Symmetry: C3
Subunit: 140 residues, 3 copies
């Protein structure tokens, strides 16, 4: 299997906070650490393919966003991780392969990739966490 | 006194220009150097606290935005400074403590922190200036 | 000729893709490489001068955006050569990274960015052109 980068990069930002939470500036996604229970939604990643009627749509995470089997958001401190599962809201079939999440069937898919906490992680340190995904296509 | 970071970070960007001012791309805050008179408004910082009914809301400036006693926006050259005062528009009571601006009373405050020029600085070199504040809470 | 920086910096981003193009996150400008024919529009750059009734409006490109203007890949090798021209067809001049207006006045308008020479072999990637507002004097 091989990923060909071809499309834009979307960067999911999450701010983890304590119960008392102070939003400063533009609205962005924040969650308290008590909200980080297994399967809790973090946020959506919008996806739209064009010209892929005969290709398999895929997303590849940055190198520091996957440590095999698993995807995770990385802290700005380059240390703390928030493990997540990613899943299309339409329940179509996709596969995870070494940092690549690709759709099992060809077609110019459009949808939402939901990001959810993978295992309870209510001890996640407050800070700013990111997951970077780049669009492209997969082959075989 | 101790600040607990718990919330998002808002970055105020200011572009200082000459009289002939050429805005390129999307709207951002720009002011001519002649406009940097004592008390001149630079811009607002929106703040919204949640789950802090029993805590004191606070903002902490980045290390390079305060040189005790005083807050300032820092140039991208990391040299030039524009000193400012920050004050809530509702005139509520806050205290400054070594880079932290905290509310005197507990409660989930929402409001606007205005940034104002602290002393005439019409000789400010044209450039891009920033002040970064992070939401959290204080104690005592 | 001298450029005085005085105004904001606008950054034009272009994502070059293959035919099968996968957009992730919020809308941004993307073009397949087959779209990069000579004169193909890349995107506009809005410009608005104030207080320059007696000055010549100008834009200065970042050092890594002119040799000829070009967008530079995020990897820092690949270049997409372009020409910039105001949509209103007003008269401007290029001087070593500076694009300045031939007459004084607080011009407002759109600086169009167009492909300069066929470049359909442009590697996929993220390309940027950074322009800073200010004014020109001889």
């Amino acid at each position: 299997g091989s990923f060909t980068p071809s499309g834009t990069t979307g960067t999911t930002k999450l701010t983890v906070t304590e119960k008392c939470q102070v939003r400063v500036g533009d609205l962005t996604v924040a969650k308290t650490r008590g909200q980080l229970t297994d399967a809790a939604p973090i946020g959506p990643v919008t996806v739209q393919a064009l010209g892929c009627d005969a290709r398999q749509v895929a997303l590849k995470a940055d190198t520091d966003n996957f440590e095999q089997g698993k995807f995770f958001l990385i802290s700005d401190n380059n240390r703390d991780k928030l493990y997540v599962n990613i899943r299309p809201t339409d329940n179509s079939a996709w596969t995870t392969d070494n940092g690549v999440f690709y759709k099992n069937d060809v077609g110019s898919w459009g949808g939402i990739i939901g990001i959810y906490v993978d295992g309870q992680q209510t001890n996640t340190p407050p800070g700013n966490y990111t997951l970077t995904l780049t669009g492209g296509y997969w082959a075989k």
